[PDB]
Each structure stands twice: as structure tokens, then as C-alpha cells.
């Protein structure tokens, strides 16, 4: 097992990198009509009847 150690230091006094989103590859969520169900997150509530 070969252990490699290295050490980094940003010499720039300000930021010196940028991370721009450039391209959407795919949209994972279906962007649909799916309302979350309050009778699943609150199953311990009801009315008087």
C-alpha cells in the first residue's frame, strides 16, 4: 500500500477559480403534477368525526 501525501495552498489573494454551469445533460425529475400528501406526513391528525 503506497501512501502519497501532498499539500496545497491558494497563492491568489482573491478567488482564482470559477465554476459555471454550462449545459443541462438531463432533467431527472419529471416536472409533473404530483402533490405531496398531507395524510402521509401527518397521519396522526383527523377531525372530530
Amino acid at each position: 500500500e503506497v501512501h502519497h501525501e501532498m499539500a496545497s495552498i491558494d497563492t491568489g489573494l482573491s478567488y482564482s477559480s470559477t465554476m459555471t454551469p454550462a449545459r443541462v445533460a438531463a432533467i431527472t425529475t419529471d416536472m409533473g403534477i404530483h402533490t405531496q400528501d398531507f395524510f402521509s406526513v401527518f397521519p396522526a391528525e383527523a377531525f372530530g368525526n
Binding site: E1, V2, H3, H4
Partner: protein, 49 residues
């Protein structure tokens, strides 16, 4: 190949897997039409100019 991850420390040697693949073979055949009298000239090499 493998990437040396130091963060998780989950060291792993290279995963050499083996698949096998078929070699296709093809067989083309054409014919050459050499006439008889020209081959008879080609066999008897002449000396007359």
C-alpha cells in the same frame, strides 16, 4: 485502471475482467478469364524478334 482514493481509504487493486468475442470469417471468389492461345504463347518463350 483504478483511482487512488485517500479519503475513504478503501484500497482496491485493478479489476481485470475477461470477455470473449467471435471472429467472423468471409470468403470472396472471383474468376479470371485467361484465353488459351495467349497462355500457349506465354509458355513457349520465343527468341525471334
Amino acid at each position: 485502471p483504478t483511482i487512488a482514493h485517500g479519503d475513504g481509504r478503501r484500497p482496491s487493486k485493478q479489476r481485470t475482467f475477461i470477455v470473449v468475442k467471435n471472429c467472423h470469417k468471409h470468403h470472396i471468389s472471383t474468376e479470371m478469364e485467361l484465353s488459351m492461345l495467349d497462355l500457349e504463347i506465354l509458355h513457349s518463350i520465343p527468341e525471334t524478334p
